[PDB]
Amino acid sequence: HHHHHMVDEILKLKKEKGYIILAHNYQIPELQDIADFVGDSLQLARKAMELSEKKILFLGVDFMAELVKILNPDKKVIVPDRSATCPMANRLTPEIIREYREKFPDAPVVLYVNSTSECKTLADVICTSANAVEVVKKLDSSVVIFGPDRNLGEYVAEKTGKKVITIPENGHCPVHQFNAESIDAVRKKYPDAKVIVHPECPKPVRDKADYVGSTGQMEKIPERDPSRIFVIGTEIGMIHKLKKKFPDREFVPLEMAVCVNMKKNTLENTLHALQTESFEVILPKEVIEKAKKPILRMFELMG
Ligand code: SF4
Ligand SMILES: [Mg+2]
């Protein structure tokens, strides 16, 4: 670290004001280092239920911050940049959900966490990339509506054998659109490397990988796989996380992939957030009341 002033002041204010700092795995290394907890969306959702502080500084994108607020309606949740969002999530609308419910009335609506809070009020259950398979398996229906990510939906259909109707038309994460050629090239360069990719990746990339999982799942792979070299097909922030957790291994990006929205949070605007205790996540009471149900069901159907 080479920003000792910013770091020391962030720590001072966090302590003075009674904040816990939660971060997603795609946040810059300097922010992961000052965070009290870093993880994927499922790990963040569980932490949001368990934590005991009354004030939360959240470092990620808006849908995630809103989930934390939904689970903690009487706590203060702040974010440094209110424009930090997921472009994929924003393409699915209430109107598309109602259209598909009318077409396939027997199918439960399973929404990825990457979805607007208004859309969550219209979901039967929420999932993350780590538990989507388990959640869909547990439901009675042989058919489900799934969105907004077509790739994760298709992965779920493969693993569960259920019919998955994806919405909207070609909803997808641009960050995870790697080329399968990139895997061919690393197999030639590193013949006993293992390739780990996200389920948001396209089918040809998933199929050529050794492992497919959420970032939380990726972090567990070196606990069971002794490979000297791992090649990682996700957003670049996870490669730092992995290097720090397993300094004895080599982690190589499959390609450079950056989520510009995840990178909106900086040391500078994080300090400003603590100085001013802004920007608070504010949601209407009715949204909190209606969206909590599919979120709590995710955990209820896990175990
Ligand atoms: S990496 Fe993709 S799915 Fe994740 S927040 Fe960024 S745009 Fe959304
Ligand atoms: Mg129905």
Domain 173-256: what homologous superfamily? NadA-like (3.40.50.10800)
Distance from the alpha carbon of residue 191 to the mean position of ligand 1, in angstroms: 30
Looking at CATH, the fold of the domain delimited by 87-172 is given as Rossmann fold (3.40.50)
Residue 73 tokens, joined: 């309606």
C-alpha 270/C-alpha 148 separation (Å) is 29
C-alpha 280/C-alpha 258 separation (Å) is 26
Resolution in A: 1.6
Residues with CB under 6 A from ligand 1: 61, 86-88, 114, 173, 175, 235, 259, 261-262
- Residue 61 CA: nearest ligand 1 atom is 5
Phi, psi angle pair for 298, to nearest 5°: -55, -50
> DSSP code of 23?
E
* Binding residue numbers for [4Fe-4S] cluster: 86, 173, 259
Q: Are 43 and 76 in contact (CB under 8 A)?
A: no
Query: What experiment produced this structure?
Result: X-ray
Phi, psi angle pair for 96, to nearest 5°: -65, -45
- Residue 235 CA: nearest ligand 1 atom is 1
Supply the residue whose CA is at minimum distance from atom 3 of ligand 1.
Answer: 173
- Select from 194, 132, 134, 200 the least CA-distant residue to 172: 200
Residue 198 tokens, joined: 């996200």
CATH 3.40.50.10800 domain extents, the chain:
1-80+264-284, 87-172, 173-256
Burial tier of 90 (Cβ tally within 10 Å: 0-12, 13-18, 19+): middle
Architecture category of domain 1-80+264-284 in CATH = 3-Layer(aba) Sandwich (3.40)
Omega before 148 cis (within 30°)? Answer: yes
C-alpha 22/C-alpha 20 separation (Å) is 7
Supply the residue whose CA is at minimum distance from atom 8 of ligand 1.
Answer: 86
Ligand nearest to the CA of 84: 1
Using most ligand atoms within 8 A of CB, pick from 262, 263, 264, 265 the residue to mutate for ligand 1.
262
233 pairs with which residues across the strands? Answer: 197
Amino acid at 293: K
Distance from the alpha carbon of residue 75 to the mean position of ligand 1, in angstroms: 26
- Select from 273, 270, 238, 235 the least CA-distant residue to 255: 235
Q: Are 254 and 239 in contact (CB under 8 A)?
A: no
Three-state DSSP at 209 gives coil
